Structure 1
Amino acid sequence: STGSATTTPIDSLDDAYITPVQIGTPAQTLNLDFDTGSSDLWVFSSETTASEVDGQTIYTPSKSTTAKLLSGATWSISYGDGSSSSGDVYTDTVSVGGLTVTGQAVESAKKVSSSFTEDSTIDGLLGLAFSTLNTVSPTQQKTFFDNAKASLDSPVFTADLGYHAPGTYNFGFIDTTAYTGSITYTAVSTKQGFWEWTSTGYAVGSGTFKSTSIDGIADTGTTLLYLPATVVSAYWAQVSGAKSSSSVGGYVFPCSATLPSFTFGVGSARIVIPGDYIDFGPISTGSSSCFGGIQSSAGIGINIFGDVALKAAFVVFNGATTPTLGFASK
Structure 2
Amino acid sequence: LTLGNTTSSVILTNYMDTQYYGEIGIGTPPQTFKVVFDTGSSNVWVPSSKCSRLYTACVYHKLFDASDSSSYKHNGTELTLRYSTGTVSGFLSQDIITVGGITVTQMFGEVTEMPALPFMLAEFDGVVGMGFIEQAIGRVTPIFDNIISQGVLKEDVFSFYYNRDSENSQSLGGQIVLGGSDPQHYEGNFHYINLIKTGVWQIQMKGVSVGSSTLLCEDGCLALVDTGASYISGSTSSIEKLMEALGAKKRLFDYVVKCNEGPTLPDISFHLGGKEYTLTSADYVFQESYSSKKLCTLAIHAMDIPPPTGPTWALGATFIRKFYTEFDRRNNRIGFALAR
Which interval holds the TM-score relative to the shorter structure?
Answer: 0.7 to 0.9
Note the residue ranges of structure 1 that are not aligned, 5 or more in a row. Answer: none
1:189 aligns with 2:196: yes
Aligned equivalents of 2:44, 2:302: Cα separation in 1? 29
Deviation at 1:238, TM superposition (A): 5.5
SS in 2 for 1:177: helix
Aligned equivalents of 1:271, 1:6: Cα separation in 2? 26
SS in 1 for 2:227: coil
Deviation at 1:156, TM superposition (A): 0.6
Aligned equivalents of 2:127, 2:293: Cα separation in 1? 31
Q: Give the aligned partner of residue 36 of structure 1.
A: 39
Q: Give the aligned partner of residue 144 of structure 1.
A: 143
Q: Give the aligned partner of residue 97 of structure 1.
A: 100
The letter of the residue matching 2:123 is T
Contact 2:253 2:301 survives alignment (8 Å): no
1:264 aligns with 2:270: yes
Query: Which has a greater percent of helix?
Result: 2
Contact 2:40 2:226 survives alignment (8 Å): yes
Out of 320, 329, 337, the position equivalent to 1:319 is: 329
Contact 1:266 1:327 survives alignment (8 Å): no
Note the residue ranges of structure 2 that are not aligned, 5 or more in a row. Answer: 1-5, 167-172
Aligned equivalents of 2:305, 2:130: Cα separation in 1? 24
What is the percent sequence identity of the aligned residues?
24
Out of 80, 84, 90, the position equivalent to 1:76 is: 80
Q: Give the aligned partner of residue 328 of structure 1.
A: 337
Contact 2:14 2:21 survives alignment (8 Å): yes
CA RMSD of aligned residues (A): 2.6
Q: Give the aligned partner of residue 279 of structure 2.
A: 273
The letter of the residue matching 1:142 is T
The letter of the residue matching 1:253 is V
Aligned equivalents of 2:123, 2:317: Cα separation in 1? 17
Out of 7, 13, 17, the position equivalent to 2:12 is: 7
Deviation at 1:237, TM superposition (A): 5.0
Q: Give the aligned partner of residue 126 of structure 1.
A: 128
The letter of the residue matching 1:184 is H
CA deviation profile, 1:175-232 (whole Å, cap 9, x unmatched): 12221111111111346x4201012334435x37788633120011111111357864
Aligned equivalents of 1:159, 1:261: Cα separation in 2? 24
SS in 2 for 1:50: coil
Contact 1:271 1:328 survives alignment (8 Å): no
Contact 1:216 1:303 survives alignment (8 Å): yes
SS in 2 for 1:51: coil
Aligned equivalents of 2:293, 2:97: Cα separation in 1? 42
The letter of the residue matching 2:94 is T
Q: Give the aligned partner of residue 66 of structure 1.
A: 71
Deviation at 1:304, TM superposition (A): 0.9
TM-score, reference length from structure 1: 0.85
Greater displacement, 293-302 / 29-38: 293-302
Distance 1:214 1:328, change over 3 A: farther
Contact 2:36 2:126 survives alignment (8 Å): yes
Contact 1:74 1:88 survives alignment (8 Å): yes
Distance 1:298 1:74, change over 3 A: closer
Aligned equivalents of 1:84, 1:19: Cα separation in 2? 21
Deviation at 1:144, TM superposition (A): 1.0
SS in 1 for 2:187: coil
Distance 1:281 1:73, change over 3 A: farther
Q: Give the aligned partner of residue 47 of structure 1.
A: 50
Q: Give the aligned partner of residue 318 of structure 2.
A: 308
Which runs of structure 2 are paired with 1:217-232 in the superposition (5 Å)? Answer: 217-227=224-234, 232=239
Aligned equivalents of 2:272, 2:188: Cα separation in 1? 13
CA deviation profile, 1:85-121 (whole Å, cap 9, x unmatched): 11122111112211221x2112111111222541352
1:295 aligns with 2:294: no
Out of 207, 214, 227, the position equivalent to 1:201 is: 207
Contact 2:42 2:129 survives alignment (8 Å): yes
CA deviation profile, 1:20-70 (whole Å, cap 9, x unmatched): 111112111100011111111110121111222132112112212211112
Q: Give the aligned partner of residue 23 of structure 1.
A: 26
